A paper describes a structure:
Citrate synthase (CS) plays a central metabolic role in aerobes and many other organisms. The CS reaction comprises two half-reactions: a Claisen aldol condensation of acetyl-CoA (AcCoA) and oxaloacetate (OAA) that forms citryl-CoA (CitCoA), and CitCoA hydrolysis. Protein conformational changes that ‘close’ the active site play an important role in the assembly of a catalytically competent condensation active site. CS from the thermoacidophile Thermoplasma acidophilum (TpCS) possesses an endogenous Trp fluorophore that can be used to monitor the condensation reaction.
The 2.2 Å resolution crystal structure of TpCS fused to a C-terminal hexahistidine tag (TpCSH6) reported here is an ‘open’ structure that, when compared with several liganded TpCS structures, helps to define a complete path for active-site closure. Positive difference electron density was observed early in refinement at two locations: a helix near the CD dimer interface and the nearby subunit D active site. A second sharp turn near residue His222D directs the tag sequence into the active site of subunit D, ending with a bidentate salt bridge formed between the C-terminal carboxylate of the tag residue His399A and the Arg271D guanidinium. The C-terminal residue His399 makes a side-chain contact with His222, a residue that provides a hydrogen bond (involving Nδ1) that polarizes the AcCoA enolate, and the terminal carboxylate contacts both His262 and Arg271, which bind carbonyl and α-carboxylate O atoms in OAA. His397 N∊2 forms a hydrogen bond to one carboxylate O atom in the critical active-site base Asp317, which is not directly contacted by either substrate. Two well ordered bicarbonate ligands were included in the final model. The striking finding that all four subunits adopt open conformations suggests that the TpCS dimer cannot close just one active site.
Author numbering:
A (entry chain A): 5 to 399
B (entry chain B): 4 to 384
């Protein structure tokens, strides 16, 4: 029997994350994300939580931040690994090309309990520097690096855009990084787990994670929802669009439904609120929000009874857009990777350090039976010669 | 709650491509034994075609196929530079990964389509040659260069890599090597790539992820490990002693022996040994390694043969590569593996996405902390 999609197959144990799909609770190391955000946590604290297993003291957090900020400095050839690419490239593909360059140069990486967390921490800073430069390259802006500031989110926004971000923007970006840190074991995490299962380096693990994330069944989810709202164009048209395209089944309602949440995504609940506030000050963005909420009611009424509700990516694009990030080049998917790099590395360490096993699944053979090899010369037989071979005079 | 450790007993897909008889020691591609394939003198292109199309090509089909592959000999300057801007101490397979990653990014119009997947794969097999040529050249501080069209892919590869006309013996050996490593089971490289294309990510990303896995020492580096082992023995008269001091006492594993499937001589090793003997005999330092290798081989077989532990493909492969002219450094042999295996990878990705597409998304068992209230940082310790 084939375990299609490895669905319901346990690839590892984890301490990091758990989801209650029926109550809609997402917990990091035991802490609910709703509680984390309501308490005003820094994303750095949640990074620390993932890498160390507990929330940091003030001093620990102070030290952790220093280590992360070392990653703000990346070599020029890593930057050039981005900028030498056609500007049309997917943003996540750009991230992949840079980390692959980085994976190649990191010849002194070793899996080691003494250094794994520092390596990962600095890499989270490098991921900010990379993402900043992916964005600038896509926008035909000069290269630049993140610099230390009061928050990791602020350092990222300010360098990405080359301006001082508002407190509200910084806060929204801080929440986004926290909300996308980890979630079960999707295809990106899984691909990375497979790579490090060979004891390949952390960077290659991330590289493989990005390769899976590039696909439209994993990446592009936040962009798809926006494209859907833009397709509707006007709020008065929502029901007509909803009828012509969703109810009769011509296309899927983007940003609805989930493999685990049979209720409202806790991440979506949080993003919706932020989306309302931030978009309210940008007339063009607020319109997208109004289209989104109007569509939301039609979706819940139609699909709510079948456990199909808004997921995290229904409103996340609107939040990113309010902050200042455009739809093009799947930039939102790159923002997802900036966040998810913490979960990825945390899972890789957990795997390699405490439950290491070479990953090597099977395939069921359903091909041709054994047959003798026929040299190319005798493969296309001359019809006339063949027919004449065992022929005799017959008239 | 049971963990499928290493996914070892999990069927991740079906395949029509490859099968192994571990008791007889037979490897079959689309029903054809590699022994029979090599004895009959097939070009690797015929085997690339067998993997991508499901049958051996006619003369006409092969001719069209070669043309598409040769288009892959021209790759953009930024793919080449994705290699050459890297430190030369970089791992060869890592250089390959960075190159394919840049390519994946530039290929913005790739779409999975039953009508075009194979032409894409064919040209990519040619690009993979172009990439490996330049990975080798960069490691050796040689100028960049591209393969040129000829009747043999193996020859186009060798002539571009070394910048000289390879002998027939060298071409044949490389052609055989490409065939022998085309596909085998579903290792971490095939698997990682399968997980990536299961999101419908592009073929190039799929290759990129496969390379990510292959870079690890539990997957890559096997040919190199065996060579390092013959070199620590240094002399052939020193073999018995080295074998007692390092193997009998369990201090290190006998490299290039044993296999998860073959409980008999690896059919790839049998073919490789013959080539290694012939090709190395003409190069004194390499011949020295072959002589160590065969002498060690006898000890291994008398000691471990009864438990079904015999020489595998990586026992002699390094000697073949060295005789052709490729050095031990930077895991170049693993890059040469990737060069061959790129056919099997793409063939598996196509088989999966076209005919058995399913998003790969396994589970993790939670064994972490129970629920706890968030504590603001002011009140910690």
């Amino acid at each position: 029997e084939i375990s299609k999609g490895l669905e319901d197959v346990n690839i590892k144990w984890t301490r990091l994350t758990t989801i209650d799909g029926n109550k809609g609770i997402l917990r990091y190391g035991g802490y609910s994300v709703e509680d984390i955000i309501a308490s005003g946590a820094q994303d750095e604290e949640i990074q620390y939580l993932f890498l160390y297993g507990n929330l940091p003291t003030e001093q620990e957090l102070r030290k952790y931040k220093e280590t992360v900020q070392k990653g703000y400095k990346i070599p020029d050839f890593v930057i050039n690994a981005i900028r030498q690419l056609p500007r049309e490239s997917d943003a996540v593909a750009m991230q992949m090309a840079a980390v692959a360059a980085m994976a190649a140069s990191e010849t002194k990486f070793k899996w080691n309990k003494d250094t794994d967390r520092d390596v990962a921490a600095e890499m989270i800073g490098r991921m900010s520097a990379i993402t900043v430069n992916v964005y600038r390259h896509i926008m035909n802006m000069p290269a630049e690096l993140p610099k230390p500031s009061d928050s990791y989110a602020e350092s990222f926004l300010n360098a990405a855009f080359g301006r001082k971000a508002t407190k509200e923007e910084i806060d929204a970006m801080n929440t986004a990084l926290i909300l996308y840190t980890d979630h079960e074991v999707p295809a990106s995490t899984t691909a990375g787990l497979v790579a490090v299962s060979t004891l390949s380096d952390m960077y290659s693990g991330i590289t493989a994670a990005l390769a899976a994330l590039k696909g439209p069944l994993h990446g592009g989810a936040a962009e798809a929802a926006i494209a859907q709202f833009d397709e509707i164009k006007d709020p008065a048209m929502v029901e007509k669009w909803f009828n012509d395209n969703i109810i009769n089944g011509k296309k899927r309602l983007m940003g609805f439904g989930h493999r685990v949440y049979k209720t409202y995504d806790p991440r979506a609940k949080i993003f919706k609120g932020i989306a309302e506030k931030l978009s309210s000050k940008k007339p063009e963005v607020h319109k997208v929000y109004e289209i989104a909420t109007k569509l939301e009611d039609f979706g819940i009424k139609a699909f709510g009874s079948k456990g199909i509700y808004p997921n995290t990516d229904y409103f996340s694009g609107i939040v990113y857009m309010s902050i200042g990030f455009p739809l093009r080049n799947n930039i939102y998917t790159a923002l997802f990777a900036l966040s998810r790099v913490t979960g990825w590395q945390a899972h890789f360490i957990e795997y390699v350090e405490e439950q290491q096993r070479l990953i090597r699944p099977r395939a069921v053979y359903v091909g041709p039976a054994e047959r003798k090899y026929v040299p190319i010369a005798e493969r296309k037989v001359d019809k006339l010669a063949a027919a004449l071979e065992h022929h005799h005079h017959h008239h």
